[PDB]
Write a protein that binds this ligand. Structure first.
Ligand SMILES: Nc1nc2c(ncn2[C@@H]2O[C@H](COP(=O)(O)OP(=O)(O)NP(=O)(O)O)[C@@H](O)[C@H]2O)c(=O)[nH]1
Ligand SMILES: *C(=O)[C@@H](N)Cc1ccccc1
Ligand SMILES: [Mg+2]
Ligand SMILES: [Mg+2]
Length: 405
RNA sequence: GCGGAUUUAGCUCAGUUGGGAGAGCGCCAGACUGAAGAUCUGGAGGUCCUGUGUUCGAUCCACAGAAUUCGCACCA
């Protein structure tokens, strides 16, 4: 609504993950401040600006994910700050599902904790290809060995879910202090402040280590719904990160999945951080106004694609790995009939597992392969990765292996 | 997104503290009546919405789903 969006740098999606309270949000606001200083039109955001709905303000925790914008000389970023409370992993999964890189925050005072693990694995099952780590709360600790240790562990954990933990950038700092500092004074620039300067380190890491992706602007348009709004005067808006291809007002699209029949609409609006875009392309975290669809007809988990470009599914073979009790998983085998939840991108749907012949019960830590029959149809594709969570926990990580129906 | 309710027989609802359900209508047999409705004797009918945890055992508890509802949040 307030301005037009003008491409002048490359665009990259990022965000925050880590164990509950390790400082994801503080650091988020601290990034806004600092960037704002050397780049004018970066609107800054305070904590309250981010954790703003009341329970969030009350309980003092992040519950909904938040989108914030910010840039550096090199690039322009959409940053998703996620909740670290285990009760809220679906939100987090949804945000991580839009990152091109994820900033994994680990409180140096606490070391790696559970969602530290979880988030890392979930990020992965959701497509996150790079992680930069920010060891926060440093101000609170000085034994270097304890710092140095937390690093190892973090790296090693990364290795486990196979992120090049050996090469992953690991920035140490206090986000609280940076923020605080920008509070005293907004205009601090690099070199002026210690604490602030670590954020420049983060900012650099992000600029440097997370490559800007290749974008298949040519393939058919595909954008996974992350959220939905009802906007004043205009209508029904669907927000998400463009998978591939593109859109501009006037194009008609398809709302696919999570429902009997798929449905058509013409996109009547395209924004990016509340700013008009002529045409959004693969990588844009956009918002789309859709001709006459109610909030009921559009929802997170469905997908926007080139009409006819896509098939929603239900059954499929899949190669899976069940997590150890130890890795935060189940501690009892399961059999056919088990119906946990499947997470593919911003989608999460319940499915009945069917063990192939020769397999009766799958145990924690195995690598099985089986069939699933989803309770709702959804945009699948072989090689598509996913997460299996059930009863409050992540129980497996697999990948589509063949589409049954 | 969050959070509460609710889901039990063909229908509508009661139970419950884990040993596993019960009534009104609705059906049926026998009685009565030409028959029907009322009455009277019996009789049949439920994966207790679903998965998992716990447990010797889960309708019930815990944790997770669905569907319906109702609050609240978010706001390209
Ligand atoms: N000493 C110190 N305390 C800090 C630092 N950052 C945060 N704290 C405090 O740590 C708490 C957690 O802050 P927060 O940023 O909400 O964390 P989060 O990681 O978003 N948590 P959630 O998991 O709920 O979303 C807040 O009190 C924050 O101010 C830091 O760098 N140093
Ligand atoms: C609209 O702002 C999007 N392009 C950015 C966004 C903001 C809020 C929620 C989701 C996406
Ligand atoms: Mg927070
Ligand atoms: Mg229950």
């Amino acid at each position: 609504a307030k301005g037009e969006f003008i491409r002048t740098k490359p665009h990259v999606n990022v965000g925050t993950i880590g164990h509950v309270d390790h400082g994801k949000t503080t650091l988020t606001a601290a990034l806004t401040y600092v960037a704002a200083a050397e780049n004018p039109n970066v609107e800054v955001k305070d904590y309250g600006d981010i954790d703003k709905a009341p329970e969030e303000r009350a309980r003092g925790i992040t519950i909904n994910t938040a989108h914030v914008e910010y840039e550096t000389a090199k690039r322009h970023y959409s940053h998703v700050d996620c909740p670290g409370h285990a009760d809220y992993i679906k939100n987090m999964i949804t945000g991580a599902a839009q990152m091109d890189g994820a900033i994994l925050v680990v409180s140096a005072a606490d070391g790696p904790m559970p969602q530290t693990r979880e988030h890392i694995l979930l990020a992965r099952q959701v497509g996150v290809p790079y992680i930069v780590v920010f060891m926060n709360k440093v101000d609170m600790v000085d034994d270097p060995e304890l710092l140095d240790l937390v690093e190892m562990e973090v790296r090693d954990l990364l290795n486990q879910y196979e992120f090049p933990g050996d090469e992953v950038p690991v920035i140490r700092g206090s986000a609280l202090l940076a923020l605080e500092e920008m509070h005293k004074n907004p205009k601090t620039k690099r070199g002026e402040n210690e604490w602030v300067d670590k954020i420049w380190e983060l900012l650099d890491a992000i600029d440097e280590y997370i490559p800007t992706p290749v974008r298949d602007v040519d393939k058919p348009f595909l954008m996974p719904v992350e959220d939905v709004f009802t906007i004043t005067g205009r209508g029904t808006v669907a927000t998400g990160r463009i998978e591939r291809g593109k859109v501009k007002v006037g194009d008609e699209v398809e709302i696919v999945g999570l429902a009997p029949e798929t449905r058509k609409t013409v996109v009547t609006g395209v924004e990016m951080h509340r700013k008009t875009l002529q045409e959004g392309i693969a990588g844009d975290n956009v918002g789309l106004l859709l001709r006459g669809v109610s909030r009921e007809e559009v929802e997170r988990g469905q997908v926007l694609a080139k009409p006819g470009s896509i098939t929603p599914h239900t059954k499929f073979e899949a190669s899976v790995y069940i997590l150890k009790k130890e890795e935060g998983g189940r501690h009892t085998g399961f059999f056919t009939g088990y119906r946990p939840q499947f997470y593919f991108r911003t989608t999460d749907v319940t499915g009945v597992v069917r063990l192939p012949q020769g397999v009766e019960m799958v145990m924690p830590g195995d690598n099985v392969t089986f069939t699933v029959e989803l309770i709702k149809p959804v945009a699948l594709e072989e090689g598509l990765r996913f997460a299996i969570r059930e009863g409050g926990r992540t129980v497996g990580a697999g990948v589509v292996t063949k589409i049954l129906e």
